[PDB]
Design a protein around this ligand. Sequence first.
Ligand SMILES: [Cu+2]
Ligand SMILES: [Cu+2]
Length: 555
Amino acid sequence: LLATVGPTGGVKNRLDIVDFVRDEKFFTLYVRALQAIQDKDQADYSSFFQLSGIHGLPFTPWAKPKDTPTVPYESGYCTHSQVLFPTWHRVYVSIYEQVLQEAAKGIAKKFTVHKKEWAQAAEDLRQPYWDTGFALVPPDEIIKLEQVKITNYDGTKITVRNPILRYSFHPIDPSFNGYPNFDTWRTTVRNPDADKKENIPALIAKLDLEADSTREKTYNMLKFNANWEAFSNHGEFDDTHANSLEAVHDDIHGFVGRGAIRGHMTHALFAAFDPIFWLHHSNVDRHLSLWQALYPGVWVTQGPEREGSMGFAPGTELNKDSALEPFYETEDKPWTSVPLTDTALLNYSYPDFDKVKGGTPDLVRDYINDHIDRRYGIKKSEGGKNPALDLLSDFKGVTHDHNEDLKMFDWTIQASWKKFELDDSFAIIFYFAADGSTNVTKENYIGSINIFRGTTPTNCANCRTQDNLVQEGFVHLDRFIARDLDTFDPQAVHRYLKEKKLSYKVVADDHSVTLKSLRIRVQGRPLHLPPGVSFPRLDKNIPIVNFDDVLDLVT
Ligand SMILES: [Cu+2]
Ligand SMILES: [Cu+2]
């Protein structure tokens, strides 16, 4: 078979998509290589179709031996809602990067002028990442431009079709026969309408709307998850107060995929065929690495298989020694989650660690902590115009030193529900209803919880580990309180949320849908900052406050 060894060459960085498109050589090589692996036949193991067929459809083994190897559970190889999510989606990007750099290495020999620079550029070609937490609105070259300007083989700037917008099937795999819409669709569709038409213009607007919420979710996900169960999966874990890596991962899949109807990107069986997928999960891997800098010594714990993949049947106990199928290091040994702590083993890194390249684990944590405080944190007011926002900035951002200890309430919208109740991907919208419920207002929009579903299991060999998984999500309210109120007291924020008529709506496709396992509430956690620390701690004096009568359902 094909061993997942990663890209060749030295240890090179995965560049930001903002900077990757400005480098002519890297962008040209990326377009050429991507079109190269796209035009190959869908039966070849090194094609875009086979690599995308690992995350979902088809339900066939990838790179398997001629000799017999039965499949334990027929589903996609993707491992979602378990402890193996980040590591599996870590090596999964490495194989795609490996073959993509192989094709680009073949294309580099097809040039004529500067044959030494264009080949070395192919040796350093790493999959760029889309920093959704900072700039949710991406550049035009990856979602909006039908044609892109690159450099031809002779050295002239030419205009070619962009292979990043979409992917044409050739042909549509018969396994998609019984799946609606996906069988009739020629190419992948982002943000579809009721007439099966791709609506990219509305998608841009949406991202521009969800920029702030995505920023806060990314920040709190990176800084306030100290254990593996609270960081890697959907599962409702005790004493949680921030989104997990997988939830923030779901937000992008739901932004690009779910429009008036369900698209490719919002279905776990067809998500990998969208070329933007690899730009998202690259940044996800970056999020993992950043988290590794903040919490060293915290890695994969043991957990059960909740929904079931092709690697493990529902009920299998998974740990750091589990086999990350179908990714192998040698022809007789599959990858495990243990060696995946060092990205340098796979010949790639990220520019966030450029300033501390070769430092102690103590210093890397401080630099990355400060870097997250400045990149995704909350800035303070100009000239002290809003003191409440300065107090909010001390807890969720850059912390100015103080003589006395500071205290405030951290407010969040917690929502818990039982996945697999409905077999359609949906979303929960939160907004203020004081102005009116018939216009999408930039200021009166809180956030949303998107659901990234796909194939559901039904039963097993009358096993016993089969337990309903509970998925939870968070939406932050602190910045909206700092804009209006002058304090974070519960007695004031109750009147703030009741006067502004904080409401929510569970929507699937276009019409409204209802589920019975949902429980939404507002949580106020007393946070205090001693005069010598910048990291907030739970205030063990005043108890946690829960409001379950403020939210309103709208249909
Ligand atoms: Cu996935
Ligand atoms: Cu994904």
